[PDB]
Design a protein around this ligand. Sequence first.
Ligand SMILES: *[C@@H]1O[C@H](CO)[C@@H](O[C@@H]2O[C@H](CO)[C@@H](O[C@@H]3O[C@H](CO[C@H]4O[C@H](CO)[C@@H](O)[C@H](O[C@H]5O[C@H](CO)[C@@H](O)[C@H](O)[C@@H]5O[C@H]5O[C@H](CO)[C@@H](O)[C@H](O)[C@@H]5O)[C@@H]4O)[C@@H](O)[C@H](O)[C@@H]3O)[C@H](O)[C@H]2NC(C)=O)[C@H](O)[C@H]1NC(C)=O
Ligand SMILES: C[C@H](NC(=O)CCc1nc2cccnc2n1Cc1ccc(OC(F)(F)F)cc1)c1ccc(Cl)cc1
Ligand SMILES: *[C@@H]1O[C@H](CO)[C@@H](O)[C@H](O)[C@H]1NC(C)=O
Ligand SMILES: [Ca+2]
Ligand SMILES: [K+]
Ligand code: NA
Ligand SMILES: [Zn+2]
Length: 805
Amino acid sequence: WTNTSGSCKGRCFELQEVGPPDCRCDNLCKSYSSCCHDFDELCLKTARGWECTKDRCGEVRNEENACHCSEDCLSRGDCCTNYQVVCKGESHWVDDDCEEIRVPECPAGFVRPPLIIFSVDGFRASYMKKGSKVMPNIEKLRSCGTHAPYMRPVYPTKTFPNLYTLATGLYPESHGIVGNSMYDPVFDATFHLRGREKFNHRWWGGQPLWITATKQGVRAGTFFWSVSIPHERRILTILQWLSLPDNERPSVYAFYSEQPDFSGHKYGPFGPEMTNPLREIDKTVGQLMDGLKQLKLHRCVNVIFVGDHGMEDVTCDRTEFLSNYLTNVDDITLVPGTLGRIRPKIPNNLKYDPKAIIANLTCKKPDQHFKPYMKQHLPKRLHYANNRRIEDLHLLVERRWHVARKPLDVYKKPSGKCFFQGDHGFDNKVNSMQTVFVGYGPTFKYRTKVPPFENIELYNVMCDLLGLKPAPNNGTHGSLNHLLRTNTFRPTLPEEVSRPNYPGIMYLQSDFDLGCTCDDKNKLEELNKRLHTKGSTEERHLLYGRPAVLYRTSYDILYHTDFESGYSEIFLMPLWTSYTISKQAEVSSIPEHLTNCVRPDVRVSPGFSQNCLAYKNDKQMSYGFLFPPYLSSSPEAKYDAFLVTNMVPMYPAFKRVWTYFQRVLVKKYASERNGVNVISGPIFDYNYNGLRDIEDEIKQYVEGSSIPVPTHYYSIITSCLDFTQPADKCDGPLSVSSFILPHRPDNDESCNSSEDESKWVEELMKMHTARVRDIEHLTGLDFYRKTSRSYSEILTLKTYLHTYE
Ligand SMILES: *[C@@H]1O[C@H](CO)[C@@H](O[C@@H]2O[C@H](CO)[C@@H](O[C@@H]3O[C@H](CO[C@H]4O[C@H](CO)[C@@H](O)[C@H](O[C@H]5O[C@H](CO)[C@@H](O)[C@H](O)[C@@H]5O[C@H]5O[C@H](CO)[C@@H](O)[C@H](O)[C@@H]5O)[C@@H]4O)[C@@H](O)[C@H](O)[C@@H]3O)[C@H](O)[C@H]2NC(C)=O)[C@H](O)[C@H]1NC(C)=O
Ligand SMILES: C[C@H](NC(=O)CCc1nc2cccnc2n1Cc1ccc(OC(F)(F)F)cc1)c1ccc(Cl)cc1
Ligand SMILES: *[C@@H]1O[C@H](CO)[C@@H](O)[C@H](O)[C@H]1NC(C)=O
Ligand SMILES: [Ca+2]
Ligand SMILES: [K+]
Ligand code: NA
Ligand SMILES: [Zn+2]
């Protein structure tokens, strides 16, 4: 029970926690119907709108007015944002020339520059191209401050997942807001954007910025705003909070608009009708900046302008129906649209067979506009599996399309058309899904463009801007130091945990009974007294230092003419294998006498080696090599590529992809990039958590052996950003692309796999692009430790994703 009979007079949008028995007058009281009786009539004052006019100047100080143009208002804190322009001859902020802000210029009493986040919903990156012509305030912020060409959202590219990611630095699988809708089988309950369930704290994991702030004694304004509070009132309320006394004023503030998402749904992202809503958002930015100017705060506050996701052309004419593939759509529930999630209509139904469902959904039409995945097979870059609220069966939908359960779910109007022309939610590397980031203020750089970056990285930066220590999150702290003039974070290299051994020859060829045969021999090699010493191997093949191993284990560094490896005695295969291929390198075949050749490695004991007998007994599993024999520098050097310590388990289906990569693509990359350095190796993630497995977690081994089966294989391909220098003699910034390829028994993912590999393997690889950082989590390795670049530059490099968009 609250006593509603109280008043909000001289209390509207107050901040304090007010508790029941007292009625409320804050941001969210409406949501709870717990407002004082006069809130609506008093705090939503709408009369005369939100701008002064020439005739209102001087103004008899009336209290029905939405905002004031009285002689005193700069005193009574209540001015319309344009009061000074219209009534005292000052200029709008946007008409003043950009001036660098080298240090905060703050009134007395301000101890740190405030942070104001201006978040916009569905603001696609390319809307910035509609520039000063339509959005001059925003264009001033963008060109005078620090901007990226775009910011990558998280998957699903919907609003709830993405705002909560912005707030927490976490992937949706970690913070728990994995869609705008979800079902939690432990709560036996469903979360929706509409209604009351969302207000329950049980859904919301992680630690969002306003809590991180509060726990560290830094006051936060409310980030949530009832839908009935108009945009202009949100701005005026921010401005009023900034005028509070020193012991009450917050340091962090957020504004949110539902636009231009709503117009984008209705008209599409390129509809001519999109102009007016963009103009309105710009107007609102200008109200803020004018209000900051009236307060003498426009050279004191750090302003972030950010979006949650983009928008794509999508109409009802472009819908696939599961009823065209499945015999009983009535027994399943589908979360539909720009993604699919399927579960039995009755939870834990024994009749539910996801294998038969996946089979009926797989490559049934030549232009099929979605693709089914078990969630553990989704591209790793999506980080969309490790949560009980994510259904096992997922549909990745093609851009511009929807998936629905059956035709009755689409409502084509008399028109022949639907009401909507725009949607989002698609794969986050899709271009139309990208959004915006601009930072302006004393802490941000002046007239600086920065590379595109992922929204998971912002939380650390907002923390930096506020003097806070971030809660553990998925950002890479220091990757965005290059956005800031100061308050940078000094990151420190993680400590290597296991140090390598450097074994020489400990064994005779006669010590080994691995069941392996090699029907040829390089007799010249046994006369090489320096065989397999470091020599120039490291200089040539390990260009940025050995990866540090950050977990406890036993491994060996192995040197060869063409490659270097870090060989695990625990997993019986390399953790990594590193080599450099010149622009002019020649590709060669595997001679007939060597096709089935595997050689024991006299540096590593029989007992730490694979055996060929296991592979001969595994009816499903074959093997491949991490350094490819195809790229051997000489016939002589080719024999090292057949070492048992270079061998890894591979399904025949995977070998189709891997041979094509090794024999064709690596050289292609070396031609185009003027040499490449490649690091390749295995990944084990049987529990799909994005993190390196411990041994207990590994669930498949080559029959009758302790040889573990990787869930994926990675490769990291580095060269000089300036391609006029060769990979091995690079003086400047680096260029990287990486992959985490799924290690599967079939190519059912690739609809065109019955064809030659030049028709499908590359399309597969582009889908499974990855960040170096993603591989680091999955392997417990740390790359690029010895370079001529700064550590902050390297962290940026490690968070880059090559998108092929
Ligand atoms: C992205 O960044 C995050 C944050 O660092 C990493 O996630 C962390 O991973 C570690 C290692 O697995 C986990 O540590 C374990 O913590 C538990 C105790 O966990 C409880 O307490 C912590 C701290 O107060 C809390 O954060 C946890 O939150 C989880 O559980 C909540 C339900 O209680 C839920 O609301 C919340 O959304 C979150 O669930 C997620 O994590 C759990 C596993 O904890 C997972 O099952 C689930 O599906 C979600 O993904 C929890 O109450 C100890 O007992 C263990 O020994 C171990 O220390 C952290 O808990 C986990 N933290 C969070 C917030 O997720 C990711 O690994 C990183 N991803 C990548 C790919 O780098
Ligand atoms: C209807 C009302 N909507 C709002 O408050 C709009 C702001 C908002 N919607 C969010 C949805 C999921 C997570 N957070 C949401 N927020 C707060 C918010 C979170 C992040 C944010 O961006 C950033 F972090 F400042 F960069 C800006 C605002 C609402 C009320 C209760 C709940 Cl549980 C969710 C939304
Ligand atoms: C798969 O499709 C076939 C018809 O092609 C059908 O007999 C079977 O019922 C379908 N199974 C499911 C689970 O939809
Ligand atoms: Ca794992
Ligand atoms: K076999
Ligand atoms: Na196929
Ligand atoms: Zn939307």
